Design an enzyme around this catalytic site. Structure first.
Site, PDB file in Angstrom:
ATOM      1  N   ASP A  58       0.822  -1.204   0.000  1.00 17.81           N
ATOM      2  CA  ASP A  58       0.000   0.000   0.000  1.00 17.81           C
ATOM      3  C   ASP A  58       0.858   1.257   0.000  1.00 17.81           C
ATOM      4  OD1 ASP A  58      -1.597  -2.160   0.536  1.00 17.81           O
ATOM      5  OD2 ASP A  58      -2.826  -1.143   2.041  1.00 17.81           O
ATOM      6  N   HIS A  60      -1.110   4.599  -0.444  1.00 10.95           N
ATOM      7  CA  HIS A  60      -2.092   5.470   0.202  1.00 10.95           C
ATOM      8  C   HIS A  60      -1.682   6.939   0.123  1.00 10.95           C
ATOM      9  CE1 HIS A  60      -5.079   2.682   1.550  1.00 10.95           C
ATOM     10  NE2 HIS A  60      -4.217   1.953   2.237  1.00 10.95           N
ATOM     11  N   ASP A  86      -4.138  -0.090  -3.472  1.00  4.34           N
ATOM     12  CA  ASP A  86      -4.302   0.942  -2.445  1.00  4.34           C
ATOM     13  C   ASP A  86      -3.318   2.093  -2.662  1.00  4.34           C
ATOM     14  OD1 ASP A  86      -6.422  -0.353  -1.340  1.00  4.34           O
ATOM     15  OD2 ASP A  86      -5.555  -0.578   0.664  1.00  4.34           O
ATOM     16  N   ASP A  89      -6.302   7.548  -1.038  1.00  3.90           N
ATOM     17  CA  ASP A  89      -6.904   7.660   0.290  1.00  3.90           C
ATOM     18  C   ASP A  89      -5.864   7.775   1.396  1.00  3.90           C
ATOM     19  OD1 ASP A  89      -9.492   7.610  -0.678  1.00  3.90           O
ATOM     20  OD2 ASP A  89      -9.699   5.433  -0.420  1.00  3.90           O
ATOM     21  N   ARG A  90      -6.285   8.324   2.540  1.00  6.32           N
ATOM     22  CA  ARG A  90      -5.499   8.409   3.768  1.00  6.32           C
ATOM     23  C   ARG A  90      -4.377   9.435   3.660  1.00  6.32           C
ATOM     24  NH1 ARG A  90      -8.519   6.297   7.871  1.00  6.32           N
ATOM     25  NH2 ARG A  90      -9.313   4.236   7.271  1.00  6.32           N
ATOM     26  N   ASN A 118      -8.648  -2.474  -2.467  1.00  7.98           N
ATOM     27  CA  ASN A 118     -10.000  -2.172  -2.011  1.00  7.98           C
ATOM     28  C   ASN A 118     -10.283  -0.676  -1.985  1.00  7.98           C
ATOM     29  OD1 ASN A 118      -8.112  -2.181   0.274  1.00  7.98           O
ATOM     30  ND2 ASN A 118      -9.917  -1.732   1.530  1.00  7.98           N
ATOM     31  N   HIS A 119      -9.249   0.164  -1.993  1.00  9.61           N
ATOM     32  CA  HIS A 119      -9.439   1.606  -2.075  1.00  9.61           C
ATOM     33  C   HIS A 119      -9.521   2.114  -3.507  1.00  9.61           C
ATOM     34  CE1 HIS A 119      -8.950   2.985   2.189  1.00  9.61           C
ATOM     35  NE2 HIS A 119      -8.534   1.736   2.293  1.00  9.61           N
ATOM     36  N   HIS A 167      -4.235  -8.119  -3.603  1.00  9.67           N
ATOM     37  CA  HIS A 167      -4.232  -7.096  -2.562  1.00  9.67           C
ATOM     38  C   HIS A 167      -4.628  -7.676  -1.209  1.00  9.67           C
ATOM     39  CE1 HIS A 167      -4.397  -3.182  -0.709  1.00  9.67           C
ATOM     40  NE2 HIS A 167      -5.633  -3.417  -0.309  1.00  9.67           N
ATOM     41  N   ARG A 215     -13.482  -6.123   9.791  1.00  8.80           N
ATOM     42  CA  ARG A 215     -13.785  -5.016   8.889  1.00  8.80           C
ATOM     43  C   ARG A 215     -15.264  -4.942   8.540  1.00  8.80           C
ATOM     44  NH1 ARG A 215      -8.757  -3.396   6.186  1.00  8.80           N
ATOM     45  NH2 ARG A 215      -7.165  -5.010   6.503  1.00  8.80           N
ATOM     46  N   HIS A 242      -2.618  -4.848   2.092  1.00  5.11           N
ATOM     47  CA  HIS A 242      -3.917  -4.589   2.711  1.00  5.11           C
ATOM     48  C   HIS A 242      -3.827  -4.241   4.197  1.00  5.11           C
ATOM     49  CE1 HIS A 242      -8.194  -4.448   2.785  1.00  5.11           C
ATOM     50  NE2 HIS A 242      -8.380  -5.579   3.443  1.00  5.11           N
TER      51      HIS A 242
HETATM   52 MN   LIG Z   1      -6.460  -2.636   1.427  1.00  2.00          MN
HETATM   53 MN   LIG Z   2      -4.654  -0.199   2.553  1.00  2.00          MN
END
Ligand SMILES: [Mn+2]
Ligand SMILES: [Mn+2]
Ligand SMILES: Nc1nc2c(ncn2[C@@H]2O[C@H](COP(=O)(O)OP(=O)(O)NP(=O)(O)O)[C@@H](O)[C@H]2O)c(=O)[nH]1
Ligand SMILES: [Cl-]
Ligand SMILES: [Cl-]
Ligand SMILES: [Mg+2]
Ligand code: NA
Ligand code: NA
Lengths: 293, 173, 515
Positions: A58, A60, A86, A89-90, A118-119, A167, A215, A242
């Site tokens: 990731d 991010h 990923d 985001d973040r 997943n992002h 991922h 989650r 992930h």
């Molecule tokens: Mn992820």
């Molecule tokens: Mn992630």
């Protein structure tokens, strides 16, 4: 679309103070999405790759940490790269992160590969930063163009018949590799099923078999599920991301699975390092660490 | 979390070319509608799902409708536990070939009766519909099999119900 | 030679760490059962077979051998003893080679090698001249040798999902081909000798890198299905007009700028035409008889700068036209003559006005005018009594005509990103309206007639800085499930209520109103 100018402007902030943005035109970012989208659809959804290769977890939106990865491992095309998803985001610079990755995908389509995380999903990155960044710096219509591009990313990769890369992790529905090839694109990520688990599931040392994921989405899987999967498909290793791990990489099930996370000091709240895994032509794997700066 | 040692139901989707066998199957598994037509040779899909509070593994075999693509079709049908006979309400020939597929199922399985459901697809194309609901129920009653109407286009109609009802027939429930 | 994973960690090298004899015993038992019954078919599929036992040589009576969904990397040479084999099914294995002994199978018709690991077509396959069906989908093949001419009895050849960059000219000796599928490869050209395969009815070339098509393509006079999407085509040959059985011409995602004049007029079975994602700056030249059979015309994502006059004069069954993302600055004078049009998409252009003769499009159900330069709307818009969806996002609309109240069938009205200050009080006559998008506007107030929208389910008021209050009659919308208020201050309402959101706001309007 002048790729070299876009890449040069993205790489200009190398060594600058962290957070310095890069100003690409809206039509330039749109061209990156449209051209990379075509390349994704022209390549398999289950990539079959060959070593030598460097695999990253990731990012991010931590763009300057991404530049550290390339400076450490060698900027493309000096080394082949596989990213496990990923990218947005973040972090504070999701746009610079994904734009450079997409630019390299167009420039070196046979030596640079990006998997879906997943992002890379409209429902997820609407909440966790990428929508706000697109709206603040550009417009919402650009965010939708990214979604159309993300919807065509490949889902998994197998390196030299031995390393299964995705991922998230395994799925109870994943019985044959051809099931992945039958996933149609473009597509959104469903709330349940094969494509969902490949981007959302996690290993768990305490669970035996399959369990529920905290989650709220997908499953957890134990060490015996990993062992039976590798034996059935004649694989040696599962390489996934992930989850944030303290050392940037973390083994599971007697080194039958490894988690890679490449965002040091994740979200500003963790003291974790980042890591990429180098795979040479003999499938000898080593780990290059990014300490939190 | 799926239970251990689950029963597997091998469902086979048969019917003339273009009736929507693949679109229904992809809608069932991936929850998207595929607008483009790519003729099927053979494809299979797998999921764990709970039907009537009983966990099951659904292995769906998607077969070829076109005669040019139909080689080895009987071998894939031979492995099935239940069948969806699909026709398009806009295709008269696909409805008339239901008798042929009904006969093929019984011949390939070497039985006088076998779990099957008649599926009338593409009912969302109301202005192009050529097979009435009464004609479908007559055909299903003639073969003593259930009748259901489906649409693979979003929003999907009776897609999950069609596959789940076939499982119910196999269970005798 | 096959490498294995190891880890260089901790100053050392570390390694990642069922009943094969029992599995092979069940295979042997199935082989004996086959001979005892003298069955002509053997099904060993889905048995985790890695090495096929050499005892298969005794089953010489076999005509069908099904070995799909196993883990075979090779086949034993004893398979060549099955001289009566007509079907060899090997899909979904790990095959990298085939034994030379297979040339003894002089009666083999079907060879299924889908989903394997072949880096080339095995040399023995080129010698199986009795084949009529050959499947090679999802392998790693880069080359089709000239020896493909030996398989002259092939009626079906599928080699999609490989890495093939070129086809040999010897492909023209497959004169009995009915279906040829080479999709998802890297072809840049097709050999002109492909015109000798005159019996082909299905030719799939999608997802390649084709720069052009050979002029001999018209010799495929029985071609009814032709896949050309996602290539680099710069032109279409004139000979394609001989393929009059084509029911659809989809050229999406290419580099085509023109078509041969009157080419479409010969495609008398054409029900759909798609020119999306190309380089068209003008319509295909040729009279209106070229559009007389198609039901749908898709030209989105081009550079078309004008729609010719009378272009649809003979398009009686053309009900869908997609002109999104082009260079249209105005509409033709006979715009109102498109009486057959049911769905019209003019989004992402440079239209400054919609003409009043739009009232002639009485059959229009979907009208998409997003991302244009409209400042107002014609009064004739109210004559579209069948209109269900009206999308006017991203324009410069400063007002709406009062005749919008006549759109009794309107279910979705998108006015996002405009300059609207108020809505006509006739907006309450849209009894079927379920979706009303008013985001990114300059609305000062909502009309009290909004309470007559009985079917209103979704209302979007986000990014409206001048909207300070909501009418109490909005609580009369019993089906209202969604109301967006992000970046909408609503000053005349209590700040705790607006911070509580639409649930507190709708209830405030309900509990602090006269209903
Ligand atoms: Mn992820
Ligand atoms: Mn992630
Ligand atoms: N409008 C509409 N189109 C549908 C529906 N179901 C399928 N289609 C369309 O009809 C075409 C044929 O669908 P498909 O699933 O490929 O048919 P098939 O039965 O698998 N044919 P084959 O046996 O040759 O593979 C596709 O273009 C698909 O999008 C439906 O319910 N509504
Ligand atoms: Cl490879
Ligand atoms: Cl196994
Ligand atoms: Mg099909
Ligand atoms: Na391009
Ligand atoms: Na699936």
């Amino acid at each position: 679309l002048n790729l070299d100018s876009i890449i040069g402007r993205l790489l200009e902030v190398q060594g600058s103070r962290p957070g310095k943005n890069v100003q690409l035109t809206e039509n330039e970012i749109r061209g990156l999405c449209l051209k990379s989208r075509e390349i994704f659809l022209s390549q398999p959804i289950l990539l079959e790759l060959e070593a030598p290769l460097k695999i990253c977890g990731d990012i991010h939106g931590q763009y300057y940490d991404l530049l550290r990865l390339f400076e450490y491992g060698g900027f493309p095309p000096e080394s082949n790269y596989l990213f496990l998803g990923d990218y947005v985001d973040r972090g504070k610079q999701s746009l610079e992160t994904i734009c450079l990755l997409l630019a390299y995908k167009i420039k070196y389509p046979e030596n640079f590969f990006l998997l879906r995380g997943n992002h890379e999903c409209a429902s997820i990155n609407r909440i966790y930063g990428f929508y706000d960044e697109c709206k603040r710096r550009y417009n919402i219509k650009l965010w939708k163009t990214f979604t159309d591009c993300f919807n065509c990313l490949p889902i998994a990769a197998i390196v030299d018949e031995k390393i299964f890369c995705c991922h998230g992790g395994l799925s109870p529905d994943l019985q044959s590799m051809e099931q992945i090839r039958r996933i149609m694109r473009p597509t959104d990520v469903p709330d349940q099923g094969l494509l969902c688990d490949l981007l959302w599931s996690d290993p768990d040392k305490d669970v035996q078999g399959w369990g529920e994921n905290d989650r709220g989405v997908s499953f957890t899987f134990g060490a015996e599920v990993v062992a039976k999967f590798l034996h059935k498909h004649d694989l040696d290793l599962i390489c996934r991301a992930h989850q944030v791990v303290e050392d940037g990489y973390e083994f599971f099930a007697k080194r039958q699975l490894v988690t890679l996370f490449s965002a040091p000091n994740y979200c500003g709240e963790f003291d974790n390092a980042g890591a990429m895994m180098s795979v040479d032509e003999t499938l000898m794997c080593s780990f290059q660490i990014l300490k939190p700066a | 979390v799926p239970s251990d040692n689950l029963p597997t139901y091998k469902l086979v989707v048969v019917g003339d070319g273009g009736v929507g066998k693949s679109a229904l199957t992809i809608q069932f598994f991936q929850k998207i509608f595929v607008p483009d037509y790519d003729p099927t040779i053979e494809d299979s899909y797998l999921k764990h799902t709970e039907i009537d509070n009983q966990w099951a593994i659904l292995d769906v075999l998607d077969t070829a409708g076109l005669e040019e693509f139909s080689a080895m079709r009987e071998q894939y049908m031979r492995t099935g536990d239940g069948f969806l006979i699909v026709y398009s309400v806009t295709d008269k020939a696909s409805f008339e070939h239901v008798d042929r597929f009904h006969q093929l199922i019984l011949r390939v399985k070497d039985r006088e009766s076998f779990p099957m459901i008649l599926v009338a697809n593409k009912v969302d194309l109301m202005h192009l519909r050529k097979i009435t609901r009464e004609q479908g129920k007559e055909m299903a009653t003639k073969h003593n099999i259930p009748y259901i109407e489906t649409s693979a286009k979003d929003p999907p109609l009776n897609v999950d119900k069609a596959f789940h009802d076939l499982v119910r027939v196999i269970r005798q429930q | 030679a096959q490498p294995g994973v190891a880890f260089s960690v901790d100053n050392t090298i570390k390694r990642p760490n069922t009943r094969k004899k029992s599995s092979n015993a069940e295979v042997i038992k199935e082989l004996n059962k086959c001979r005892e019954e003298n069955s002509m078919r053997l099904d060993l599929s889905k048995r985790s077979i890695h090495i096929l036992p050499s005892s298969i040589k005794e089953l010489t009576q076999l005509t069908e051998l099904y070995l799909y969904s196993n883990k075979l990397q090779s086949l034993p040479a004893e398979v060549g003893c099955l001289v009566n084999l007509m079907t060899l099914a090997l899909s979904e294995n790990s095959l990298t080679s085939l034994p030379d002994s297979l040339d003894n199978l002089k009666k083999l018709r079907m060879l299924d090698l889908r989903h394997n690991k072949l880096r080339e077509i095995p040399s023995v396959v080129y010698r199986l001249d009795s084949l009529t069906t050959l499947y090679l989908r999802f392998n790693r093949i880069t080359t089709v040798e000239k020896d493909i001419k030996n398989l002259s009895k092939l009626s079906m050849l599928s080699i999609r999902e490989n890495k093939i960059k070129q086809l040999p000219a010897e492909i023209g000796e497959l004169c009995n081909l009915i279906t040829l599928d080479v999709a998802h490869n890297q072809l840049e050209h097709l050999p002109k000798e492909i015109g000798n395969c005159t019996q082909i009815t299905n030719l799939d070339l999608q997802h390649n890198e084709l720069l052009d098509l050979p002029d001999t393509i018209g010799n495929l006079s029985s071609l009814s299905r032709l896949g050309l999407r996602y290539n680099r085509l710069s032109a279409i040959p004139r000979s394609l007009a001989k393929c009059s059985a084509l029911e659809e011409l989809n050229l999406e995602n290419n580099n085509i700028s023109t078509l041969p004049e009157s080419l479409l007029s010969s495609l008398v079975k054409l029900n759909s035409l798609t020119l999306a994602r190309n380089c068209f700056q003008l319509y295909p030249v040729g009279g209106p008889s070229q559009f007389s059979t198609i039901y749908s015309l898709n030209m989105e994502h081009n550079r078309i700068n004008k729609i010719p006059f009378g272009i649809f004069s003979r398009a009686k069954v053309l009900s869908k036209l997609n002109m999104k993302d082009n260079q249209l600055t105005s509409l033709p004078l006979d715009f109102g003559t498109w009486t057959s049009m049911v769905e019209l998409n003019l989004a992402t252009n440079q239209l400054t006005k919609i003409p009043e003769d739009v009232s002639g499009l009485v059959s229009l159900e979907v009208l998409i005018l997003s991302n244009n330069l409209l400042k107002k709307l014609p009064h004739g818009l109210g004559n579209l009594r069948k209109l269900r969806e009206l999308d006017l996002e991203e324009n410069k609309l400063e007002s709406l005509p009062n005749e919008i109240a006549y759109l009794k069938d309107l279910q979705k009205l998108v006015l996002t990103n405009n300059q609207l200050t108020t809505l006509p009080r006739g907006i309450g006559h849209l009894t079927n309206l379920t979706h009303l998008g008013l985001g990114e506007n300059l609305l000062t107030h909502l009309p009290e007639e909004i309470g007559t929208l009985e079917n209103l389910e979704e209302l979007y008021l986000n990014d409206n800085p001048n909207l300070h209050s909501l009418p109490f009659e909005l609580a009369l919308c019993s089906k209202l499930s969604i109301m967006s208020i992000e970046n909408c201050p609503l000053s005349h309402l209590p700040p705790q209520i607006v911070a509580g959101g639409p649930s507190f706001i709708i209830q405030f309007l309900k509990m602090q109103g006269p209903y």
